[PDB]
Amino acid sequence: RVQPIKLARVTKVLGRTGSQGQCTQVRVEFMDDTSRSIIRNVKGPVREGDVLTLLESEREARRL
Amino acid sequence: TKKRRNNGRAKKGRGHVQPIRCTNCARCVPKDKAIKKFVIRNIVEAAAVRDISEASVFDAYVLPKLYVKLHYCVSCAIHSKVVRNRSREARKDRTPPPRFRP
Amino acid sequence: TKKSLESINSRLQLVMKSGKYVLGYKQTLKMIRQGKAKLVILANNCPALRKSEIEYYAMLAKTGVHHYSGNNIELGTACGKYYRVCTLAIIDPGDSDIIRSMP
Amino acid sequence: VVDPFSKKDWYDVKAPAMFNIRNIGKTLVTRTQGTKIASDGLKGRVFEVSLADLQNDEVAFRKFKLITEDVQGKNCLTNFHGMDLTRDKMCSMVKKWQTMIEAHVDVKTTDGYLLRLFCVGFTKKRNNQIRKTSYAQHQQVRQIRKKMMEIMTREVQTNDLKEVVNKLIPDSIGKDIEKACQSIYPLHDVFVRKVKMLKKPKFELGKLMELHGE
Amino acid sequence: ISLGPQVAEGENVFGVCHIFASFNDTFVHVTDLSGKETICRVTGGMKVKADRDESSPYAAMLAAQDVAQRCKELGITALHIKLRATGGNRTKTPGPGAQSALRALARSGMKIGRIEDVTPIPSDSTRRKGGRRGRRL
Amino acid sequence: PVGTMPEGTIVCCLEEKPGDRGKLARASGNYATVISHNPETKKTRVKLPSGSKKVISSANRAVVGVVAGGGRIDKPILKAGRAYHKYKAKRNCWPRVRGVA
Amino acid sequence: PLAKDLLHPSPEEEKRKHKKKRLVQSPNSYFMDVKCPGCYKITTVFSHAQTVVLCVGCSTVLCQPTGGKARLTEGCSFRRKQ
Amino acid sequence: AKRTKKVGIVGKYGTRYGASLRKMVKKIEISQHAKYTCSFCGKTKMKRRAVGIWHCGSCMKTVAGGAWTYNTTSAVTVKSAIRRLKELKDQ
RNA sequence: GCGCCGCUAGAGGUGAAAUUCUUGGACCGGCGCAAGACGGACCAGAGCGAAAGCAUUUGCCAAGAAUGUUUUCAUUAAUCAAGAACGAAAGUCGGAGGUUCGAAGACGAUCAGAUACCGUCGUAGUUCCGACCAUAAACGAUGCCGACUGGCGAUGCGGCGGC
Numbered sequence A: 001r002v003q004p005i006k007l008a009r010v011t012k013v014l015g016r017t018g019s020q021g022q023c024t025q026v027r028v029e030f031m032d033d034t035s036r037s038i039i040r041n042v043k044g045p046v047r048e049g050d051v052l053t054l055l056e057s058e059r060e061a062r063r064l
Numbered sequence B: 001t002k003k004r005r006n007n008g009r010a011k012k013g014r015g016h017v018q019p020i021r022c023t024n025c026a027r028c029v030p031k032d033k034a035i036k037k038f039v040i041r042n043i044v045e046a047a048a049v050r051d052i053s054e055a056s057v058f059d060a061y062v063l064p065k066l067y068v069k070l071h072y073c074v075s076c077a078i079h080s081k082v083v084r085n086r087s088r089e090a091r092k093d094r095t096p097p098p099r100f101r102p
Numbered sequence C: 001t002k003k004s005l006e007s008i009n010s011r012l013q014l015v016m017k018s019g020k021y022v023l024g025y026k027q028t029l030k031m032i033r034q035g036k037a038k039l040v041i042l043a044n045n046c047p048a049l050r051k052s053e054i055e056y057y058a059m060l061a062k063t064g065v066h067h068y069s070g071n072n073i074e075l076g077t078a079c080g081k082y083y084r085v086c087t088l089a090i091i092d093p094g095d096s097d098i099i100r101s102m103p
Numbered sequence D: 001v002v003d004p005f006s007k008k009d010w011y012d013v014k015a016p017a018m019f020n021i022r023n024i025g026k027t028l029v030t031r032t033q034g035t036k037i038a039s040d041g042l043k044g045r046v047f048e049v050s051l052a053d054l055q056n057d058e059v060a061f062r063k064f065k066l067i068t069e070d071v072q073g074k075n076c077l078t079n080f081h082g083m084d085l086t087r088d089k090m091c092s093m094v095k096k097w098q099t100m101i102e103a104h105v106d107v108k109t110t111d112g113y114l115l116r117l118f119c120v121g122f123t124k125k126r127n128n129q130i131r132k133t134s135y136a137q138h139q140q141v142r143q144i145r146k147k148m149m150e151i152m153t154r155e156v157q158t159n160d161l162k163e164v165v166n167k168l169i170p171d172s173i174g175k176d177i178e179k180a181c182q183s184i185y186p187l188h189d190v191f192v193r194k195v196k197m198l199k200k201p202k203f204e205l206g207k208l209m210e211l212h213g214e
Numbered sequence E: 001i002s003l004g005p006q007v008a009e010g011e012n013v014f015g016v017c018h019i020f021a022s023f024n025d026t027f028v029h030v031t032d033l034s035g036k037e038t039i040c041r042v043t044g045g046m047k048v049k050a051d052r053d054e055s056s057p058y059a060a061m062l063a064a065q066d067v068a069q070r071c072k073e074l075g076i077t078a079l080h081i082k083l084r085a086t087g088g089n090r091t092k093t094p095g096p097g098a099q100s101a102l103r104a105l106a107r108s109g110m111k112i113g114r115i116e117d118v119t120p121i122p123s124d125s126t127r128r129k130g131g132r133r134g135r136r137l
Numbered sequence F: 001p002v003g004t005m006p007e008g009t010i011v012c013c014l015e016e017k018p019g020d021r022g023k024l025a026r027a028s029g030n031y032a033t034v035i036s037h038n039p040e041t042k043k044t045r046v047k048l049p050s051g052s053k054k055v056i057s058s059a060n061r062a063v064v065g066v067v068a069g070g071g072r073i074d075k076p077i078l079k080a081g082r083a084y085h086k087y088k089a090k091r092n093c094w095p096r097v098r099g100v101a
Numbered sequence G: 001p002l003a004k005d006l007l008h009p010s011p012e013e014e015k016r017k018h019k020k021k022r023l024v025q026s027p028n029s030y031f032m033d034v035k036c037p038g039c040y041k042i043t044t045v046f047s048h049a050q051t052v053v054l055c056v057g058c059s060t061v062l063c064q065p066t067g068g069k070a071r072l073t074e075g076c077s078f079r080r081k082q
Numbered sequence H: 001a002k003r004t005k006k007v008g009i010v011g012k013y014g015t016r017y018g019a020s021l022r023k024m025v026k027k028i029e030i031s032q033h034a035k036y037t038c039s040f041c042g043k044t045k046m047k048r049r050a051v052g053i054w055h056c057g058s059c060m061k062t063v064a065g066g067a068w069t070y071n072t073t074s075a076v077t078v079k080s081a082i083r084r085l086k087e088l089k090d091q
Numbered sequence I: 001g002c003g004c005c006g007c008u009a010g011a012g013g014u015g016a017a018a019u020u021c022u023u024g025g026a027c028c029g030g031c032g033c034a035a036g037a038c039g040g041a042c043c044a045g046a047g048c049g050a051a052a053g054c055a056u057u058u059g060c061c062a063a064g065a066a067u068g069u070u071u072u073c074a075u076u077a078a079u080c081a082a083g084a085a086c087g088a089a090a091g092u093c094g095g096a097g098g099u100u101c102g103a104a105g106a107c108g109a110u111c112a113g114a115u116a117c118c119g120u121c122g123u124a125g126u127u128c129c130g131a132c133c134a135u136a137a138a139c140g141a142u143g144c145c146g147a148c149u150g151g152c153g154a155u156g157c158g159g160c161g162g163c
């Protein structure tokens, strides 16, 4: 229920998505171990190697 | 014009084959026109592997696979893009596409 | 019900072609009380006290009783004729082994 | 307003004495309030347990059933009900370009435990075999299938239920129809697929309490 | 202290959990080892107010949260998984709320034992509700 | 007794109360099926030939099988005289004047 | 192969055709002598035999009819004649 | 000879009662007036007495059968399942 | 579908939704039982059949091709007006049965309109026995019998020979 708002550094950017070229898949790593790594998506421009903070950490990836 | 040498179907020495039914739209197709696809998908959704093996009651658990045979009418095989419309001379090969697993 | 009931009714017609026998109730009754009948055959249709005493003299003559699974019109055609026969006794088989079968 | 989980209590479920691990798990049942006593509410509960959490090393794709037949206070004593395989194993071993043969037979023990045995078997591709289809012919199928059901009709009608269910913790039946059929056609995935229960012999209470002894 | 089993620190009790993850809904019903005494059934359609999202994976995510936050609240601590599809006459692949109901059941504090797909597969029976040309959307 | 025969059996001439000596499904072609024994509060249900399911006693005595004479309503009466002889043996009800006329 | 001398074939090519379709047709059968173990009586049994042939005095089974060419029963002395 | 061509046994009703009603009767009528092979003696002597009552000219044995035919197929379906339930589970 | 338990307010169905089912406790989970259908995966450019067609196990009955044959008879053959035999599904008449599906019809939608697509229900029908009808994109859109005229690998059934 209550999650810590957890921050995460990105490895390789997986190219644009989102049907308008608006969303970027980024594959974050959770700052505490590099073994735990989910693929997620942000909007706005990325700069590989930076830090972004997940308001809730694990929801879904882009697959049908 | 006759388009294909076999008539889209793999029957030669018969008169009649069984009708089976399409998976998504439930349409009556013969067993040898139907586009078959056998799926050996792991049931664990490989993103969710290192979240259950730490929650496991073992140290090395063999995760079960899921074995579901799909088969399609070709009006829903083309729309779902499991087969693709091909050129008139790249049609005469029955070899499957490559795998490309890693 | 598929392959091999031509052990009973095909060895029975072989005796019919070759060997010696009697058909009918009271002919077997004569043959079984003077010992000359080697094997008596009863049909499924035969009345229950007629069956009970044909078995009873073969207990006395020390001969075998076979219960042919079939009608008496079925046992008559299995003989190869247009009668209906519940009870027969083969008294000299030709060369087949109805006696040296299962009983 | 009322909580239905306060009127309940947790019993614990035991295995027959022929298994290594004896304590299966912990079921629960309501307490007695008048008519519904706490001993008919959990008779005939089937506990689908596998070998791997019931033996020290044995495989996970084989499960058993274990009906409840007695309550001895907190203890909940079980007796054999049937087995089958897990379905992931069952359709990993169904592959193309091989003949699948199956047999079934209704055999009762010397203990009065009429069973129905389901066995499968799959024809084997050889180690220098170049041709793709390792199919058997139909008269080879029929004499394998006669050989399959003849062997298990022996080794269940031999003696009581106890040595029969103890026979297929290691599944020496599937090894037996393996070795005795491969001079007809070689087979490679030969399991007793399912055991189904047809009769119960009167529930002698002494026979069950033999099964939870030493 | 009428609620809870008799367990120590180290020992855990098992109950089976049925993931009926079809389309149009998902069930994360959990029960005892015999499967006869229901411990906690909650449904993804009971925690959305949308009716599109009964079969969402986000509905199955927080339904699996609630069923684990009640299971551990009782005293049952580890779960067998008995995932289903619709099976039988209909489709035999599970729906979208299968994997999210399984992973949310693992991230939110619960141990996992034997897992198995248990959907009904027939020996060719029971003609299917489509007609002969199927359904034509 | 119906408490001893297993489920799905075909029964004619069954008692609707114990001792009644046979009341239900007595006409030609008729039968009743037993379903759903209840060993506690000893009472079984049956399926009457009108499709009504009805719970009865466990000890209602009943004869296994279907009544002889079935198929009797498959042949037409086919002329007015054979309906005359049909009801001459039963009652006085057959030439029925319409109340409209 | 425009110049196969198809009136004088090699006997290697002549052997490995059908018993019809040859330049001159001829059978694949023969006659064979069989010493049953324990008698003087050479039997002159046919190769592709069809009946169960028995010996005269030592009246055990001699050969068994099967699909094409007769399975002899005992490993017994044997020679192809003429 | 072929004295009639379609009506057969129901030529005795003549031009009366309809076309389908006469065609409905001539199936039932050739069935209650037939001589059936006796299962008890083998002679084709089973003649129908009153409705439901079937009797032998020889061996004199009375069988409770169907209304218009000797074996109602609803009744034979019962006997196949009664002996199934008898041997299976043994009550 | 119906019993008997368990826990709970929804379940169902759609691109959406609704008609509909539901605290006289539905769906869901368990144990049972009944009934009628249907034989999955193995199942293939594999087999058999004159064609239509034929797939659960064992088992009475009759048939059949191919192969093997230094057996037999010695042109007994080919195609065929007339005249017949069988022939999917639907359909008709009659009796059993009636689970599922489902023309017709009823409703809910979607729609400018919906006598359609989609959804809920559902009659005949679909299953069996008996009697009819004799038509299909009954298609390999290629009549049957006979011979000759390239190659190569493979397959199914026989027969023969070899590490």
Ligand SMILES: [Mg+2]
Residues within 6 Å of the ligand: F096, F097, F098
């Ligand atoms: Mg009137």
Ligand SMILES: [Zn+2]
Residues within 6 Å of the ligand: B022, B023, B024, B025, B026, B027, B072, B073, B074, B075, B076, B077, E134
């Ligand atoms: Zn489709």
Ligand SMILES: [Zn+2]
Residues within 6 Å of the ligand: H038, H039, H040, H041, H042, H043, H045, H056, H057, H058, H059, H060, H061
């Ligand atoms: Zn008689």
